[PDB]
């Protein structure tokens, strides 16, 4: 909890959550990779039990949800792909947020299992569709909407 | 199967029903929320009048147009027969 509240971010903008959900994160071969496998759902769950900001964005604009859906092995280890996502959306993971490169996490799926899991965990909201419509049509919202609504627009 | 909004004057009642449902059920529904005897109101398809023997889905109220996201605007007029008076919505930006 202390480490999380000391806002650790890497050079890619990755938090501890981002590297926890990242399969590309290397694991030491010397008597370590035999146990520690990435991505790991439990530690991410422990990150959620420790109040890690699930809505963080990296230098790419991707959140942990945007990276966990990029896993290329939904057959060999499905649970480590599923139990994390439900753990991801447990304290305010916003499934409809859109990254800097303007890609929905459902768009960055490349896996039917991952996108159907996201859809099952997805829940609709009027604010999501309204912000998506405003951003897709480019209405001037600056100095006209509350600042938190501007941040939500930036999320979409 | 149908999802339509009952727009009368000031009030606008959003309602769902089925194609097999009849106009009489809609009249019973609007009686308990607006307190007018059934002979005092007449339902309108845009400006066309209807009757009670016909079902709701009979007079062009199909599911492909009475969808919940785009409900049909059915007009009513309460007696005191008063004409179909529906004011427009406030001006959008």
């Amino acid at each position: 909890y202390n480490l999380i509240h000391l806002d650790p971010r890497t050079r890619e903008g990755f938090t501890l959550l981002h590297l926890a959900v990242n399969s590309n994160t290397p694991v030491d071969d010397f008597h370590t990779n035999d146990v520690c496998s990435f991505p790991n759902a439990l530690v991410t769950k422990l990150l959620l039990d420790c109040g890690a900001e699930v809505n963080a964005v990296d230098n790419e604009g991707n959140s942990a949800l945007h990276i966990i859906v990029q896993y290329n092995r939904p057959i060999s280890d499905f649970l480590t792909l599923h139990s994390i996502i439900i753990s991801l959306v447990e304290a305010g993971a916003h499934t409809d947020m859109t990254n800097k490169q303007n890609k929905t996490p459902l768009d960055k799926s490349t896996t039917g299992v991952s996108e159907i899991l996201l859809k099952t965990q997805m829940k609709m909201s009027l604010k999501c569709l309204a912000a998506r419509a405003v951003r897709a049509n480019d209405i001037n919202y600056q100095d006209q909407i509350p600042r938190t609504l501007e941040e939500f627009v930036g999320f979409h | 199967d149908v999802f339509l909004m009952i727009r009368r004057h000031k009030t606008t009642i959003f309602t769902d029903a089925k194609e097999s449902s009849t106009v009489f059920e809609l009249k019973r529904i609007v009686e308990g929320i607006l307190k007018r005897p059934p002979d005092e109101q007449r339902l309108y398809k845009d400006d066309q009048l209807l009757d009670d023997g016909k079902t709701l889905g009979e007079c062009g109220f199909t599911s492909q147009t009475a969808r919940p996201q785009a409900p049909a605007t059915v007009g009513l007029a309460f007696r005191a027969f008063e004409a179909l008076c529906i004011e427009p919505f406030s001006s959008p930006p």
């Binding site: 006209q144 909407i145 509350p146 600042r147 938190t148 | -």
Partner: protein, 227 residues
Amino acid sequence: TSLKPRVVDFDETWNKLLTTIKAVVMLEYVERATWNDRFSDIYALCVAYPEPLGERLYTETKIFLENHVRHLHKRVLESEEQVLVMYHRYWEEYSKGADYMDCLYRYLNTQFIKKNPLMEIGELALDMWRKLMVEPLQAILIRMLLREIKNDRGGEDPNQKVIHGVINSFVHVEQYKKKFPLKFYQEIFESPFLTETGEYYKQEASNLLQESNCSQYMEKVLGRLKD
């Protein structure tokens, strides 16, 4: 007007909001139009242009709640012998009022409290109820609760509603702490009541050892347990 942010002075609107919420926390009567308009008032204040005064409103609400609960604590102290009835009666005015205030501040929690380290009003109103009404005025409460339940044990039938509300007015305080919500009631009342019950039944069993032989001892213990 509308939902567009605007610049509005906090003073008179906060005073009028105080007028509303003081009646809210006292289980009084307020107007539905007034009540509904307070939602818009809280929304407009929370995103008042250009500086969101949600921190300011939060601090002012904290000040009001602390002052109100401390005044109620002083009032309950005056009813020194009958504070159990006074605490129970004023808790009923407060608990439902606390939840009503929590619902009233719904926009504050959804936008400011959980999105900025902070405590929501419903948890804070209960938190103001424990740190300023329960924890300071605790020893008298527990000792006379034990005395009243001892009287109930012996021959009396005191106000079950008052004791039941007050006892549940401990678990109802920490309902917002997910980790061990029963922790406060687990020690404030539970342990002294445990010890008092143990000692009272110890001396009761010592009395009944010689009051009756081993035959009637079974029936007497069963009756005491059933009661």
